[PDB]
Amino acid sequence: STDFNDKILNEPLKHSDFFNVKELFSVRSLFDARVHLGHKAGCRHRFMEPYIFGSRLDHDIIDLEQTATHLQLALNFTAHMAYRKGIILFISRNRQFSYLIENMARDCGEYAHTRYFRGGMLTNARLLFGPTVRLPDLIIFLHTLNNIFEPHVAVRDAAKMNIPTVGIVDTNCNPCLITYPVPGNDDSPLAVHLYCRLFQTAITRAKEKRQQVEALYRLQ
Amino acid sequence: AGSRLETVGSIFSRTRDLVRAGVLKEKPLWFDVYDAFPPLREPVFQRPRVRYGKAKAPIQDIWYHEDRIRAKFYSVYGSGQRAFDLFNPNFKSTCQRFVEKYTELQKLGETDEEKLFVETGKALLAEGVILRR
Amino acid sequence: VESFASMLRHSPLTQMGPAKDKLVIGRIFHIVENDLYIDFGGKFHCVCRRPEVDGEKYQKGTRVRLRLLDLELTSRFLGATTDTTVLEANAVLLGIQE
């Protein structure tokens, strides 16, 4: 099993972009998807200031150059986690996109939670599912805020359970506890569709890469 | 299982310390990936603060030179009766064409703001664009 | 390579300037009885009432003329450190785009 590990689980970690996630998007594409449009300055969160290019007529604009690097890191992490067959859970309380996110999660062979988040799903999972339940290895927030404009409880719960989190953080969100924050617009349907497409493509490509690497190793 | 103190350090630091201390027998599946490709900022909890005194946000207002011209246009000729099509990535409003003509005149002539405005209006009317003051 | 600064400078939304009393083109993408949800290229959509004149013509995908009042409706209330947002724009429905 030593050769198994060294060749399959350690090989991808020696390359900067093993799954080639950089070609999935560009600053032009993000601008076309209106990823740069934030909320007005009155709703601005302090910790989101370093990611804000400026304010255009009292409307915050998200610096897409930083968004590109953050999205690259988040997509690389997601692809690597999917390559290792980790359980990936998408979370979003924006009811306008619940159907899309559930369809995407079903498509890429991952899991979704777009419904009311009950107390203790993560911190009390053994009582709520069973003593031998396996929790997610990665949680992806397409919307980090609930419907009262406060952080989704799952962010703090995942931080408590030491589960890495990827997250789309708008100008009025708190990125302190999200492991891989991606500053961008989370309201416009174009941006959400782009995020879903990128994450689904990355996960599918990672799983296919794992399968073909295993096949090659078995053949040789 | 790991520590549930989400406000102390980060998940990476807590997991690393518990693994080295022997509390956790094996590293989680994500530890190696995090170590190889860390985030730009370590995810450490911080309490947001309200600013007081002269402390101000460092966010700047986005302004361009042409905005001045736009303002004057929107103050003189008003909002164009033609509607904006924001879906088109290369939409050109009447104000935008006025701005481009103004800049071309400035680069090909002298700098007198009123004269540039009036001659730009003459040029646009010559091209055949209606402009009601 | 085009930088983000150039994109923002030459964006139609940036060129529009102030959004008050500006005529824009929107597209109907959702209908709930007589409530039409219209996207006009901004961060948020606007909810308009179906006009009593030629109301049948207003269907999904229809192009409509709007007079923008606010791109996002927000308001700071007493005892609040942050603005409260409705996550919608304010616009007036003028008619259909011929």
Binding site: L57 | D61, W63, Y64, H65 | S6
Partner: peptide, 25 residues
């Protein structure tokens, strides 16, 4: 980069509202 924003007072700032008797004795 020439496309970067420049520091400037708001050119779209509307004139501040006046009462009906402002400027009159």
């Amino acid at each position: 980069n020439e496309d970067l924003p420049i520091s400037m007072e708001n050119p779209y700032k509307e004139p501040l509202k006046k009462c009906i008797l402002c400027g009159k004795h």
